[PDB]
Amino acid sequence: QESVKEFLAKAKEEFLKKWESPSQNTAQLDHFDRIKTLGTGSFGRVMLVKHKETGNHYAMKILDKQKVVKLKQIEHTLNEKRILQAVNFPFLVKLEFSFKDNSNLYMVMEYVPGGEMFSHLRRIGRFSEPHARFYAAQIVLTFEYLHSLDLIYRDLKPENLLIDQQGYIQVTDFGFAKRVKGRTWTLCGTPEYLAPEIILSKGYNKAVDWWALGVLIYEMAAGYPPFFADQPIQIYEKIVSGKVRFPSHFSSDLKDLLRNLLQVDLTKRFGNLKNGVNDIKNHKWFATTDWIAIYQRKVEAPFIPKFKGPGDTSNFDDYEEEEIRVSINEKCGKEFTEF
Ligand SMILES: O=S1(=O)N[C@@H]2CNC[C@@H]2Oc2ncccc21
Ligand SMILES: O=S1(=O)N[C@@H]2CNC[C@@H]2Oc2ncccc21
Ligand SMILES: O=S1(=O)N[C@@H]2CNC[C@@H]2Oc2ncccc21
Ligand SMILES: O=S1(=O)N[C@@H]2CNC[C@@H]2Oc2ncccc21
C-alpha cells in the first residue's frame, strides 16, 4: 500500500535525523520532586517525579553508572537512550528529558498511570481474544515501525507494556533494543520470551521479536506463557523442542497464528517471510482488526484502567524507598561520554 510505504519512508527519515544528532543534557535532577518508586531492578529503578516548574508528572528511569558498568550494560544503556530519543510512534513511550550527573544516568519519560499490562493480566486471569487482539495489533504496528528502522526490540513481555489513560499500550523499556542491519548475537531478554535461535547462541534477527509476539499473545489469551518451568534450562528445552500445547478455549484461528509465530525455524516464522508483517496483518485471527483505526487510536479500548489523576500511583506496586545519591565525585565519566 502506497500510504504504508510513504509512511515508513518518512518514519525512517525522521528517525535517522535524530539518530545521527542525539539530544543530551536536557534537564537536571533538582528540577524534579521525587514522589514514589514505580519499579526496581539490578542496576536502576523508575520513579514517579513531578517537574517543579510545570507540575507535570514523569516516569524517571535512574541508572547507577557503576552498576551499569559492573553488569556489562554500557552499550545497552547507550542504545536505549539513543533509540528512545529518536523514535516517534503512538504506542512507544515518549522520552521527554535525559541527563546524567556524577553517579547516575536519567531518562525522563511520559508517566502512564494505568500500570503494567502484567498486573491487569494477572488480576483478570486471562484476556478474551478480542482484548488480546487489540493489544497484539498495537504490537504488530509498533514492530512494523521499529523493524523498518532496523531496530530489534528484544524485551517484549507483559511487564514492559503499560496501559494508558485511553486503554492503549505504551511500550517502555528499550534496555535491550538495538539498531541492527542483519544479525546480532547478545544473549539478553527474559527466558520465557526467548526465541530458539537466541537460546542456541546463533546470530539472530528481527524474527525474535515475532517469536516473542507469539509468546505474548499466548500468555494474554491463556493467562500463562507457553513455556515455563522453575529452572531456565528447562524452559530452554521446551522452547527449542517445537512443541506447544494450546488451551481448548483458544479459537482455531488463534492456534493457527500461534503455530506460525512460535515456529522454531526462523526462516519459516511469520513476520520473517517474503511478505513480512503482512502475513500477520492478513491472518484470519486479525480479520476483525481495522489497522488504520488502531494506529489512529479511534477504536474504543476493551478496558480503561481505574485511576484518579495524572499523579495516581495506585496501579503500581510498593517498593522500598531508597535514596537517589549523587556522589561528590564523577563516576565512569569516560564510559558515558555520549549519553
Ligand atoms: O512500573 S515500571 O517500573 N515497570 C517496568 C519495569 N521496567 C520496565 C518498565 O519500566 C517502567 N517504565 C516506565 C514507567 C514505569 C515502569
Ligand atoms: O491516552 S493518551 O492521553 N496518552 C498516550 C500516551 N502518549 C501517547 C498517547 O497519547 C494519546 N494520543 C491520543 C489519544 C490519547 C492519548
Ligand atoms: O561484554 S560484551 O561481550 N557485551 C556485548 C556483547 N556483544 C556486544 C557487546 O560486546 C562487548 N564489546 C566490548 C566489550 C565487552 C562486550
Ligand atoms: O486525569 S486525566 O485522565 N484527565 C485530565 C483532565 N484534564 C486533562 C487531564 O488529562 C490527563 N493527562 C495526563 C494524565 C492523566 C490525565
Domain boundaries, the chain: 4-21+116-306, 22-115+307-337
Ligand with smallest separation from the Cα of 162: 1
Q: Ligand 4 pocket test: pick from 93, 165, 166, 304 the residue with the most ligand atoms within 8 Å of its Cβ.
A: 165
Count Cβ atoms below 10 Å from residue 2 Cβ, excluding itself. 6
> For the sheet containing 44-51, what is the strand order?
32-40, 44-51, 57-64, 104-110, 95-100
Question: In the chain, where does DSSP find H-type helix?
Answer: 2-20, 65-70, 74-86, 117-124, 129-148, 196-199, 207-222, 232-240, 252-261, 278-281, 291-295
- Looking at domain 4-21+116-306, its CATH class is mainly alpha
Is it true that domain 22-115+307-337 has CATH number 3.40.50.10860? no
Closest by CA to 261, choosing from 248, 247, 279, is 279
CA–CA distance from 134 to each of 73, 111, 209, 301 (Å)? 33, 22, 18, 7
State the sign of the Cα–Cα–Cα–Cα dihedral 220, 224, 226, 229: positive
SS3 196: helix
Q: Ligand 1 pocket test: pick from 35, 37, 38 the residue with the most ligand atoms within 8 Å of its Cβ.
A: 38
Q: Would you say the CB of residue 165 lies under 6 angstroms from ligand 2?
A: yes
Specify the amino acid at residue 284. Answer: K
Q: Which long-range contacts (CB under 8 A, 24 or more apart) does 23-26 make?
A: 23/85, 23/98, 24/98, 24/99, 24/338, 24/339, 25/98, 25/99, 25/100, 26/97, 26/98, 26/99
- How was this structure determined? It was done by X-ray
Tell how strand 95-100 and strand 151-152 pair up.
unpaired
Ligand with smallest separation from the Cα of 71: 3
Q: Would you say the CB of residue 75 lies under 6 angstroms from ligand 3?
A: yes
Count Cβ atoms below 10 Å from residue 273 Cβ, excluding itself. 17
Q: Would you say the CB of residue 49 lies under 6 angstroms from ligand 1?
A: no
Q: Would you say the CB of residue 309 lies under 6 angstroms from ligand 4?
A: yes
Radius of gyration of the chain (CA): 20
Query: What separation in Å is there between the alpha carbon of 311 and the centre of ligand 4?
Result: 9
* Residues of the binding site: 38-46, 61, 110-116, 157-160
Give resolution in angstroms. 1.5
Yes or no: say if 5 and 283 are a contact pair by the CB < 8 Å rule. Answer: no
Q: Would you say the CB of residue 310 lies under 6 angstroms from ligand 4?
A: yes
CA angle 48, 172, 250 (to 5 degrees): 125
Query: What separation in Å is there between the alpha carbon of 44 and the centre of ligand 3?
Result: 20
Ramachandran class of 97: left when φ > 0, alpha when ψ lies in -120 to 50, beta otherwise: beta
